[PDB]
Amino acid sequence: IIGGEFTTIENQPWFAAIYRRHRGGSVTYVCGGSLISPCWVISATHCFIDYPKKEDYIVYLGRSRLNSNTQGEMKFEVENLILHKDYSADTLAHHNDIALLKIRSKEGRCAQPSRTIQTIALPSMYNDPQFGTSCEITGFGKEQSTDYLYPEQLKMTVVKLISHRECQQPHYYGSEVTTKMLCAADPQWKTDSCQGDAGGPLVCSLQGRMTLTGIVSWGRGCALKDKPGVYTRVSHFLPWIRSHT
Ligand SMILES: N=C(N)NCCC[C@H](NC(=O)CNC(=O)[C@H]1CCC(=O)N1)C(=O)Nc1ccc(N(O)O)cc1
C-alpha cells in the first residue's frame, strides 16, 4: 500500500495473509485475500497461476505482521485451490482475476470469529456503489513502487471509486479495463495499492454493511497520475463464487 496508515488486523479482521512454502524450506509471502465464509478465502488468480499446487500454500487469519507472530492468529492449509478457468493476462490487464481457497486447519477446523477474525459480506448480484464513493484497501504490499521489501505491519488506505467512463479514457486505461473490473484511486493520486497487495480487499459501505466490492488486481505502476488501481468487480462473479462454494 502506497501512503495511508499502518493498522492492525482488528480493523480488517477478514484479511487473510497467504504464503508459499519453498521446496527447500523457505516460506515467503504471496498475496492477500478475504475471508468470505468460515471455510473460504477469496483472492486473485494471478497470485497462484505460476505455481498452482495447493499443498505449497499457507493461509493465516488474524495476522497483523508479515514475518512475526500476532496473538490470536490461526494458520490454515489449503484444502482446495480454485482458480478461474477463463483467467487471462494481457499487456496490463488481468481478466477474470479471482480465486478461491478452501481452508482447513491441521486439526480439521475452519475459521472461528474472534476479536481478530471475522467474515466480510459479498455484495448482491451486480450491485456496486456509486462512483465517487470512498472505499478501503488493505495489504502487506510495497509502500513505494521502487522498494525491494514489504512492510512488516499491515497497512490500509482510502481511495475513491471511479466511473468506467473516466477509467476508459485513453490517457487512463482505455480498452484494457472492462465491466468485470472497477477502478479506484486517490483524487490527488497520492495513495494506492501496489505489488504485494494483490488478492486483498477493496471494502465499501453498502446498505449499512462493509461489503467486499473488489479484489486488488492490477494498475500501471503504483499511485501514478491517471493510472488508477484496478480491482476485480466482485458483484459480477457471484455465480462463480456460489458454484465453486
Ligand atoms: N493498484 C495498483 N496500482 N497496482 C496494483 C498492483 C497489484 C499487483 N498486481 C500486479 O502486479 C499485476 N500486474 C501488474 O500490475 C503489471 C501491470 C503494471 C505493472 O507495472 N505490472 C500485485 O500485487 N501483484 C502480484 C502479482 C503476482 C504475485 N505473485 O503471487 O504471483 C503477487 C502479487
The ligand 1 atom nearest the CA atom of 230: 1
Q: Is 97 in the pocket of ligand 1 (CB under 6 A)?
A: no
The ligand 1 atom nearest the CA atom of 50: 31
Task: Report CA 223 to chain centroid distance, whole Å.
Answer: 17
The CATH code of the domain at 13-119+236-245 is 2.40.10.10
Beta-strand pair 74-83/99-104: antiparallel
Nearest CA to ligand 1 atom 31: 47
Show the cell assigned to 181.
473490473
Residue spans per domain, the chain? 1-12+120-235, 13-119+236-245
Nearest CA to ligand 1 atom 27: 47
Say which residue the cell 483524487 belongs to.
187
**How much distance in Å is there from the Cα of 24 to the middle of ligand 1?**
26
Residues 6+ apart with CB under 8 A from 7: 64, 138, 153, 154, 155, 156
Q: Is 221 in the pocket of ligand 1 (CB under 6 A)?
A: yes
The ligand 1 atom nearest the CA atom of 229: 1
From 195, 220, 231, give the residue whose CB has the most ligand 1 atoms within 8 Å, as the site to mutate: 195
**How much distance in Å is there from the Cα of 160 to the middle of ligand 1?**
19
Q: Do 160 and 213 contact (CB within 8 A), yes or no?
A: no
What's the reported resolution, in angstroms, to a tenth?
Answer: 2.1
Method: X-ray
Q: How far is the CA of 202 from the CAs of 75, 80, 146, in angstroms?
A: 23, 23, 23
Q: Is 92 in the pocket of ligand 1 (CB under 6 A)?
A: yes
